[PDB]
């Protein structure tokens, strides 16, 4: 049995919720809180452990970006800290390649990162790699055939439809075809060997559109759009379907959870979170 875990988020302030959705019986399990309330973080799973990476503690008593890496074990229902990144990374993107975590982009105050670093769990160590070609906050990250894709984002002045790809062996980045739509804070995942980019913010509207990249044709194609436009959504793949959780539609913080079936190219609302939030980290384990 595998669950969809959501960690952190933002609703009037950063959150500590770790909750786990069961797509079969519909339940939400309330698990151990994060050590620190964080929003705009990213979630990943390595070796059956859930990692929460980066983010920002927004509190009524102050605001601070986060370089933190923390680790949750479903067998003990406990969190443990890890070694932190070199720099705080709010609205971060992450991906996993060969059991290594790649932290990508994000902001630290007024700094908009192009820097990227790699985490080795077997040694609890972080190391800088080659920086992206673009500074990207709110960047979507996906991993396709052991290649690391950074998609969209915001460079401090302009939001982006461009995308680049990191080759770890060469340790270098190369631009790829840009998306059809400028997207900041979109949900980016990999499903059945295509990269999906759903929602986000183009500087004027929150987006409901969804487009996917084929490496064969090197092309982005629109698919069915989501029911509710949303930016700063969480996104994950569970049993060959895409789940998008929460986000912000320009007025409210959503608790809606939508599900994409690629075989029908349809979206459907499957559950609601226990409370609306944006900027969560989500993963499956």
């Amino acid at each position: 049995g595998r669950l969809i875990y959501t960690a952190g988020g933002y609703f009037r302030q950063s959150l500590s919720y770790l909750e786990a959705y069961n797509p079969s019986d519909g339940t939400w399990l309330r698990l151990a809180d994060l050590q620190v309330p964080r929003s705009g973080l990213a979630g990943c799973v390595v070796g059956g452990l859930l990692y929460a990476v980066g983010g920002r503690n927004n509190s009524p008593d102050g605001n601070t970006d986060s370089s933190a890496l923390d680790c949750y074990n479903p067998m003990t229902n406990q969190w443990s800290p890890c070694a932190p990144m070199s720099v705080p990374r709010n609205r971060i993107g992450v991906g996993v390649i060969d059991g290594h975590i790649y932290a990508v982009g994000g902001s630290h105050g007024c700094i908009h990162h192009n820097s990227v670093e790699r985490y080795e769990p077997e040694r609890d160590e972080w190391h800088l790699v080659a920086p992206m070609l673009t500074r990207r906050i709110g960047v979507g990250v996906a991993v396709l055939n052991r290649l690391l894709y950074a998609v969209g984002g915001f460079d401090g002045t302009n939001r982006l439809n461009s995308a680049e790809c990191y080759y770890p062996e060469r340790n270098e980045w190369r631009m790829i075809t840009a998306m059809n739509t400028i997207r900041s804070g979109a949900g980016v995942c990999v499903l059945h060997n295509c990269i999906y980019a759903a929602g986000g913010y183009d500087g004027q509207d929150q987006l409901n559109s969804v487009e996917r990249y084929d490496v064969e044709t090197e092309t982005w194609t629109f698919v069915a759009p989501m029911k509710h436009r949303r930016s700063a959504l969480g996104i994950t793949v569970h049993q060959g379907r895409i789940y998008v959780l929460g986000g912000y539609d320009g007025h409210t913080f959503l608790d809606s959870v939508e599900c994409y079936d690629p075989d029908t190219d349809t979206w459907s609302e499957v559950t609601r979170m226990t409370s609306g939030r944006s900027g969560v980290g989500v993963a499956v384990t």
Side-chain angles (χ1 to χ4, degrees), residues 1-121 124-168 170-203 205-226 228-285:
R2 287 229 221 237
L3 311 170
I4 295 166
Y5 292 71
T6 180
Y10 186 90
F11 181 56
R12 312 228 201 278
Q13 40 149 348
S14 307
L15 318 168
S16 304
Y17 305 136
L18 173 67
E19 299 169 300
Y21 177 59
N22 191 324
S24 309
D25 74 11
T27 50
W28 284 97
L29 264 164
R30 182 73 191 268
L31 303 175
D33 285 348
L34 284 159
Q35 197 53 52
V36 189
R38 303 145 69 173
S39 61
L41 75 158
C44 71
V45 165
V46 187
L49 295 179
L50 178 83
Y51 294 83
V53 194
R56 167 177 187 97
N57 182 4
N58 268 79
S59 289
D61 273 301
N63 307 312
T64 309
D65 297 324
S66 188
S67 69
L69 173 71
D70 296 276
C71 189
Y72 173 80
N73 187 344
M75 308 150 242
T76 71
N77 193 30
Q78 281 173 348
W79 285 95
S80 320
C82 295
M85 299 175 284
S86 66
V87 294
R89 294 176 189 273
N90 182 26
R91 306 184 90 238
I92 190 187
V94 302
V96 172
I97 306 176
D98 295 326
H100 293 359
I101 308 174
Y102 282 88
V104 179
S107 61
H108 177 212
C110 280
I111 303 287
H112 319 277
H113 298 310
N114 55 25
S115 54
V116 177
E117 38 198 304
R118 184 192 71 250
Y119 177 72
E120 308 181 59
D124 189 45
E125 266 173 32
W126 284 94
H127 298 285
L128 262 292
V129 301
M132 284 178 299
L133 301 176
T134 324
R135 300 175 181 274
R136 301 188 191 268
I137 126 154
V139 57
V141 173
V143 171
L144 197 41
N145 306 330
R146 292 146 307 281
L147 289 185
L148 182 77
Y149 294 79
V151 174
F154 175 57
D155 70 16
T157 307
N158 296 279
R159 307 188 154 77
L160 315 158
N161 61 319
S162 70
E164 41 194 301
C165 170
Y166 178 70
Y167 298 73
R170 287 319 95 147
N171 177 40
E172 73 182 18
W173 289 90
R174 286 202 134 256
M175 199 74 72
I176 65 166
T177 309
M179 292 179 296
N180 301 277
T181 306
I182 283 168
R183 301 177 192 271
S184 186
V188 173
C189 65
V190 56
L191 175 58
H192 293 162
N193 296 295
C194 281
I195 299 173
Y196 285 77
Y201 181 56
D202 67 9
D205 309 306
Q206 296 77 35
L207 319 169
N208 59 28
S209 58
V210 180
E211 55 187 304
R212 75 175 164 215
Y213 185 79
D214 199 326
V215 246
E216 294 158 322
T217 60
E218 302 119 2
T219 304
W220 291 96
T221 309
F222 283 107
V223 299
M226 297 173 295
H228 304 295
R229 333 178 143 257
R230 50 180 90 223
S231 167
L233 53 146
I235 189 165
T236 200
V237 171
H238 181 288
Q239 276 167 25
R241 290 187 173 89
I242 291 174
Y243 291 79
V244 299
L245 294 77
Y248 172 81
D249 71 354
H251 296 92
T252 88
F253 297 81
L254 294 64
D255 53 19
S256 176
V257 175
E258 303 195 42
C259 182
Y260 180 72
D261 175 19
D263 293 320
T264 56
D265 183 47
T266 69
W267 286 93
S268 46
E269 227 157 17
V270 289
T271 192
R272 293 200 181 277
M273 285 187 301
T274 60
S275 62
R277 59 198 88 155
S278 54
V280 293
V282 51
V284 166
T285 201

